[PDB]
Amino acid sequence: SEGPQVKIREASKDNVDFILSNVDLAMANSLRRVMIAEIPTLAIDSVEVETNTTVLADEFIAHRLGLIPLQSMDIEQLEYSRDCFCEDHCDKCSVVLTLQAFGESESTTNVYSKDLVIVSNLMGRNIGHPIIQDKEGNGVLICKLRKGQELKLTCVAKKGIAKEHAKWGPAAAIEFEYDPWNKLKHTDYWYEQDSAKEWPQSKNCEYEDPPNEGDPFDYKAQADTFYMNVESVGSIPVDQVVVRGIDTLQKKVASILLALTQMDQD
């Protein structure tokens, strides 16, 4: 337990801010990279269009649908279509949603993400439901229709990682900073008259003491005490984002070790 330390400054449903102390720069950077590009998530992958009389194109609507965030709390219970034994897809590795919208009113009618209806067997899981994160209760404004226009389609959502396509990315911006006082001299501050007066002070400067103003440069110091803030799109809880990022990195290292042992046997 006497390893990396964590101190949470602000916790919310969309942003988690913490200080990661007693850790290496490589480890912190790898953590953020994994949290950005290697957390599995559920998103719409294939779309079959039955009727489309809209002013928008089928590929346009398919891209917009694929960018909708879907719940992925129980994603680990879902299987990869590539690793599943089925013809095209099944309930064990995919979720099927349906969209049916008609212009029954004279005024413009908006097709949101809340209109997507799950027609697959979730088997008691907690995946598939589009994320609603607004006061009105609607979701993403998928499209607009006028009177007489219909949109009928079926979406098949599969699990993946953001490395394959950014639509599976469960994490938004990640604030990442260290050494706000530039005590390690990792940056040469560009300036015209006075660098201190021309460069604003970072908000994290309050958590570290200022330089002694006359002390010799510390050449034995190493980067540590990172300030991080993870923002989540809503597919999974932010704390779950961090936990699963650590889990993914650990699994990757364990896979390296397992491959090394496999080669050792031969």
DSSP 140-157: -EEEEE-TT-EEEEEEEE
CA 118/CA 124 separation, integer angstroms = 13
**Tell me, what amino acid is at 123?**
M
Binding part of the chain for Zn ion, among 1-9, 11-19, 85-93, 142-150 by CB under 5 A, reads 85-93
Q: Which is nearer to other proteins, 88 or 124 (CB)?
A: 88
In the complex, minimum distance from the CB of residue 90 to other proteins, in angstroms, rounded to a whole number:
20
In the complex, minimum distance from the CB of residue 94 to Zn ion, in angstroms, rounded to a whole number:
6
Q: Which is nearer to Zn ion, 41 or 225 (CB)?
A: 41
CA 80/CA 67 separation, integer angstroms = 19
Structure tokens, 138: 């609607």
CA 180/CA 187 separation, integer angstroms = 11
Binding part of the chain for Zn ion, among 22-30, 84-92, 200-208, 232-240 by CB under 5 A, reads 84-92
In the complex, minimum distance from the CB of residue 87 to Zn ion, in angstroms, rounded to a whole number:
9
Structure tokens, 184: 């390690």
Structure tokens, 198: 């021309």
> According to CB under 5 A, which one of 6, 57, 86, 166 is a site residue for Zn ion?
86
In the complex, minimum distance from the CB of residue 95 to other proteins, in angstroms, rounded to a whole number:
19
CA 212/CA 209 separation, integer angstroms = 8
Question: Would you tell me the crossing angle of helices 25-37 and 238-265 to the nearest 10 degrees?
Answer: 110
Restricting to residues 90-119, which ones interact with Zn ion according to CB under 5 A? 90, 92-93
CA 122/CA 127 separation, integer angstroms = 7
Q: Which is nearer to other proteins, 121 or 201 (CB)?
A: 201
CA 191/CA 238 separation, integer angstroms = 38
Please give the backbone phi and psi of residue 103, each rounded to the nearest 5 degrees, phi first: -85, 75
In the complex, minimum distance from the CB of residue 125 to other proteins, in angstroms, rounded to a whole number:
23
Binding part of the chain for Zn ion, among 67-75, 88-96, 199-207, 220-228 by CB under 5 A, reads 88-96
Total residues found in the chain within this entry: 266
Q: Which is nearer to other proteins, 123 or 256 (CB)?
A: 256
Return the DSSP state at 49: E
Binding residues for Zn(2+): 84, 86, 90, 93
231 touches, from other proteins, Zn ion, none (C-beta below 5 to 8 Å by class) = other proteins
84 touches, from other proteins, Zn ion, none (C-beta below 5 to 8 Å by class) = Zn ion
In the complex, minimum distance from the CB of residue 123 to other proteins, in angstroms, rounded to a whole number:
26
Collapsing DSSP to helix, strand or coil, 1 comes out as coil
> According to CB under 5 A, which one of 49, 56, 67, 84 is a site residue for Zn ion?
84
Binding residues: 84, 86, 90, 93
List residues binding Zn ion (CB under 5 A): 84, 86, 90, 92-93
